[PDB]
RNA sequence: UAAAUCGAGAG
DNA sequence: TCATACGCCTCTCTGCTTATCGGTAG
DNA sequence: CTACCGATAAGCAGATCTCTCGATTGCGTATGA
């Protein structure tokens, strides 16, 4: 799948095919747009179909989109969610967001479908609420934590990552520590997940997940996060207006 | 202290004011002529990097090192054009590049036999490439009698 | 003006001394780390004349250099007192090269050289006569930060390198015979040099070039 | 496209039920992502949406010739007064509910009416597919052109990117 | 040929190609330079195009 | 049947034998490169599709590439990789000695 | 041209005209730059299309002429270089990285002692001779990468990477000991090596050409008085 | 190199002109060729594909084919494809004999 | 040009063309050093 | 079914 | 008188290459 | 004195991603009708 002009390697990868029986446009996920340098814009791009087993096995392995997470220009990552998934993550990972048991379970199953192979374990496992009484209340950071804990393969420790994001501590109030993203044993405990975590940002959560669990787990995490922030954005939509 | 021209031998006399050991020049040809090929490669890398740095774009030094080494592969300040291209074993690559007529006569006058090594020649003759998955063969272990 | 000329002469003398020491002949730190006062005391007349007749010397190889290159022989450094290059003045040194059986000779001229000498420098093989300029030796090029360290490789090391990388002599990166460091090292054609580049991503790493 | 250079291909025909209905029952016929605005700074679209909403509410036509409003007669205030008089939100927002979950959205959604033009670049004049069709004569390669059932071209850049991967069999 | 530095087909690399090209160019320039053919000492007519 | 072909065959085999690097002195990467893995998988898939015998349990699999990946996981691929050095010499590694990832 | 208006309250007619001027210049430059970079990228890739990493870890052209003995001097992939300096991150996820790498199964086909011994000897030699001038530093022990294959000898790492690892292990005194962490990171360096057959020349040409398409985004005009005023950007690349 | 032209319309290109420029034979017919089995269309987003797949329209899915050779394991799937035919996806368009 | 119509040789000296031919023959097999070492056989 | 020139466009 | 085949009918960059005016040895 | 060797002055030659549409195609002349 190629778009012109092909200025580098990433502008021509090999995608698996999903036959969507609706209309006549090539439908592309949202992470690839950063590498392909296209907008859904009237933009057009070719789709070549290799016709022998060597080319099949060599576009599935050497030219596949998973292997092109980092561009060779400087080693910086090139994939990641782009525009509204970032805002959805900023709103969901803020400590002002609490979810009941039903909302928590629905948000988890909306992206960790075990029938398609999204999660390794055959049973979706959840977390105890952050507020036991008066009534249970989870958190968006708990949503991220259990998403990671479900996609991450078992018999392996979590991600111990310490990073930062672009929103200063003064924006969240006084005495706040939301500028420092902290992962401990695979559980998100501080800071929000803005563009600096998933996207064209170095040493983020997705970059660390890639470097620890291989590129396939990073791709799965990217897809799952994009699906989760999509389902969260329908329930609590993001809007801009004249008052802003 | 920066100047607006290149002449090293003049500042060599002014050792009292100027430390002659750290005289680095923007120009590459003069550096090659007065300091050697390796200094030319170093200044090529530095000049090709400082333009990227000024634009806040990061390019790993392996790419620039490879470019400089390819540019000074004959001990001379070569370039990426037909005037610094004719020194190549494979002719089909140059003919595909440009001036197909001129490079054809220069290859047919001396009966230049080419071994189909560059990707351009292999593409012309329709052979499997030599870079990547084509840099080796594959054999089969047949258990006969 | 004579003070500046003497300073340039002393800098050229020190550069020649360092060049010979790098080439691999027995030169101690004496006569190399010679201060300007010592230079005026020894290589200067009652007025301050350069007296380049007295600064000519013969350099002998070290024991380690002899072991490395058995064919290496003695060298002679000649300073031209005549402002230009004279045919007879250069011919005297040229004939003395084989009169004393000198394998190598170094010539330092002031301004320019007659082009009959250019046809005459390769007249006594295998003895090599390498010519230099007084204004070109004011600053040692190898001392520059940009210039890496060049080490000539013996026949054994060159053969080992070629066998290890399965190369032909012509497939290595080339260094010009007129390169300023090639003249410094006195590299013959076919002699592989070793370069230790201070890479930005690997610190020290060794690269090889062949003189051709 | 709108009248402010906001391009975009239609993505999906969102069913009316899944469309986010408003308090009054109006389900918008076109959804534009809010992220398109910060980079292009087309605040004219924001002004036009609420101006048109006020015009449709009051049954009047609002003029929009440049340089009628100034820094003391801001159009946002001018049409927000009309919206408030009609009884809607002064900032053009509208209480909206998600059509899939039925619960009220987190914030007040910005709604209005804007003039929209359908461009002539339909997808029926841009899509091609070739398995095996007519070929050339002196090169035996597929012909050029969509109307001729011809193949697409992979150029020097595409070949370089195909060998940049190390993929030799893909190139072949 | 005996010690293995070159086979009977001849070794052809970039630097030997460059040296051969330079030698041939200099040979042509020297050929076109001097008249008065020294094999027999006779001037020859000058061609033009 | 001339000796003008026997001599050519003999010299060809002599040159090929002098080209081969003995197993005791090959000095390349013991790991299997990504290109080598991809080419091995593709060639094995081609052979399987062309009705070559298989050694793994075909647990309801129809993709020759998937069968090749399963064989590579079980290290039962009967293929030998001839890594080529720039001069022309080659070392005959096989998939068994080569270790993946 | 200094317009005091804003896109929320609108811009006056003269400010509108000036902003139209600026937008037109921006669009003209955007149109020009894309065509400008194409010839540079094409020439670079046409010349460098053949040079590739060989099985000696020395990169060279298609015919065989050597360009570099080691890719950048270290032969490590730029893509996999990302987390070779993050010693804190590697120490934190030691257990996950060890499960990923499995040093137990990477022993029967590896040599561990010779490269490590030579690396220690060379490191002590450089530390003893560090306070020496660049030209006077006579080479007695070449870098370990020169002799021992980094893809077959554990511990044959770069001088920069080894220096950084030793400095980190000395400054940061932490169940993981320094020995196991050093072994894990040496295995990480071994696995983070560029594979033979990489189209390094194509990669270099693309990585030098494509970033030049993002040129003139930052203008930084030479507003200084009597400055260098050296040519900048695509013209400088062309020269 | 041709000589002689007063007004003319277009000077017939020589065999050299057929191999020289960017539109010549080399740069237009071996350094890059038109390809069979390839499609092109407009792209539209889809956050419901697994970040590594492509949304192939059914119009493309009925024209682009792959030559799968029949085997013991492929017989059922390919028999079903042949029965479905060239119009009902998944299906087959040709059966290349031995 | 650069040819003689009378003796039917080049206008160069036979010794010079022989030296050039020897240099080119040496460069044919790749003896890039012996070609330069051949110049000092003026005697 | 072609081939060239010019004109209008999309990314 | 008058139609289709034959005969043509003026605002960018890098080198390389040739010719021509100065100089040195013999 | 004069030929070989250079050192400009001028001219010459070669350069400066894909895709979709539409339109168009010479005067000039000279003899058998
Ligand atoms: N001459 C050219 N060559 C290659 N691509 C071109 C081009 N002219 C236009 N394009 C394409 O036009 C599109 C414009 O996109 P860009 O301007 O680079 C990102 P943007 O500025 O953020 O757009 P936005 O303001 O709509 O958000 C690109 O996809 C580019 O490929
Ligand atoms: Mg686009
Ligand atoms: Zn004659």
Short mmCIF file of C-alpha atoms in Angstrom, two decimals, chain C residues 98-199:
data_model
loop_
_atom_site.label_atom_id
_atom_site.label_comp_id
_atom_site.label_asym_id
_atom_site.label_seq_id
_atom_site.Cartn_x
_atom_site.Cartn_y
_atom_site.Cartn_z
CA UNK C 98 73.83 7.09 -3.77
CA UNK C 99 77.36 8.16 -2.84
CA UNK C 100 76.38 7.61 0.80
CA UNK C 101 73.85 4.91 -0.21
CA UNK C 102 70.78 6.68 1.16
CA UNK C 103 67.45 4.93 0.63
CA UNK C 104 65.42 8.12 1.14
CA UNK C 105 66.03 11.84 0.72
CA UNK C 106 64.04 14.88 1.87
CA UNK C 107 64.38 18.20 0.05
CA UNK C 108 63.16 21.54 1.43
CA UNK C 109 63.11 24.50 -0.95
CA UNK C 110 62.26 28.14 -0.29
CA UNK C 111 60.04 29.40 -3.12
CA UNK C 112 59.87 27.14 -6.20
CA UNK C 113 61.58 24.29 -8.04
CA UNK C 114 62.85 23.91 -11.60
CA UNK C 115 60.76 21.41 -13.61
CA UNK C 116 63.83 19.59 -14.90
CA UNK C 117 64.18 18.43 -11.29
CA UNK C 118 60.64 17.06 -11.50
CA UNK C 119 61.88 14.91 -14.37
CA UNK C 120 65.06 14.29 -12.35
CA UNK C 121 63.65 13.31 -8.93
CA UNK C 122 62.94 9.70 -10.16
CA UNK C 123 66.46 9.29 -11.54
CA UNK C 124 68.04 7.08 -8.86
CA UNK C 125 65.73 4.14 -8.09
CA UNK C 126 64.76 2.70 -5.69
CA UNK C 127 65.92 5.71 -3.66
CA UNK C 128 63.06 8.16 -3.17
CA UNK C 129 63.54 11.94 -3.19
CA UNK C 130 60.60 13.74 -1.58
CA UNK C 131 60.50 17.53 -1.85
CA UNK C 132 58.84 20.01 0.51
CA UNK C 133 58.34 23.75 0.97
CA UNK C 134 59.54 25.99 3.78
CA UNK C 135 56.15 27.74 3.89
CA UNK C 136 54.26 24.42 3.85
CA UNK C 137 55.96 23.08 7.00
CA UNK C 138 55.21 26.05 9.26
CA UNK C 139 52.29 24.16 10.86
CA UNK C 140 52.16 20.41 11.40
CA UNK C 141 49.00 19.19 9.67
CA UNK C 142 48.79 15.98 11.72
CA UNK C 143 48.45 18.11 14.88
CA UNK C 144 45.13 19.49 13.62
CA UNK C 145 42.00 18.39 15.46
CA UNK C 146 40.27 17.36 12.23
CA UNK C 147 43.17 15.22 10.98
CA UNK C 148 43.07 11.70 12.49
CA UNK C 149 46.08 9.51 13.29
CA UNK C 150 47.62 7.78 10.27
CA UNK C 151 49.74 4.66 10.85
CA UNK C 152 51.54 2.92 8.00
CA UNK C 153 50.92 -0.83 7.85
CA UNK C 154 53.68 -3.36 7.29
CA UNK C 155 53.48 -6.12 4.69
CA UNK C 156 52.34 -8.64 7.31
CA UNK C 157 49.57 -6.41 8.68
CA UNK C 158 48.42 -5.43 5.18
CA UNK C 159 48.31 -9.08 4.09
CA UNK C 160 46.39 -10.02 7.24
CA UNK C 161 43.88 -7.23 6.62
CA UNK C 162 43.40 -8.28 2.99
CA UNK C 163 42.94 -11.92 3.97
CA UNK C 164 40.51 -11.03 6.77
CA UNK C 165 38.26 -8.83 4.63
CA UNK C 166 38.80 -10.89 1.44
CA UNK C 167 39.68 -7.73 -0.48
CA UNK C 168 41.77 -6.91 -3.49
CA UNK C 169 44.34 -4.14 -3.16
CA UNK C 170 42.22 -1.90 -5.40
CA UNK C 171 38.90 -2.32 -3.54
CA UNK C 172 40.00 -0.37 -0.45
CA UNK C 173 39.27 3.34 -0.06
CA UNK C 174 41.98 5.32 -1.82
CA UNK C 175 44.22 8.12 -0.56
CA UNK C 176 45.90 10.40 -3.10
CA UNK C 177 49.68 10.26 -3.43
CA UNK C 178 49.60 14.08 -3.37
CA UNK C 179 47.54 14.14 -0.17
CA UNK C 180 49.18 16.32 2.52
CA UNK C 181 49.23 13.40 4.95
CA UNK C 182 50.45 11.00 2.24
CA UNK C 183 53.48 13.23 1.68
CA UNK C 184 53.90 13.38 5.46
CA UNK C 185 53.95 9.59 5.78
CA UNK C 186 55.99 9.05 2.61
CA UNK C 187 53.60 6.35 1.43
CA UNK C 188 54.59 4.37 -1.64
CA UNK C 189 51.90 3.12 -4.00
CA UNK C 190 50.28 -0.01 -2.60
CA UNK C 191 51.06 0.70 1.06
CA UNK C 192 47.91 0.50 3.19
CA UNK C 193 47.58 3.17 5.86
CA UNK C 194 45.54 2.91 9.07
CA UNK C 195 43.24 5.69 10.29
CA UNK C 196 41.84 5.92 13.81
CA UNK C 197 38.80 8.17 13.46
CA UNK C 198 37.20 9.73 16.54
CA UNK C 199 33.66 8.86 15.50
#
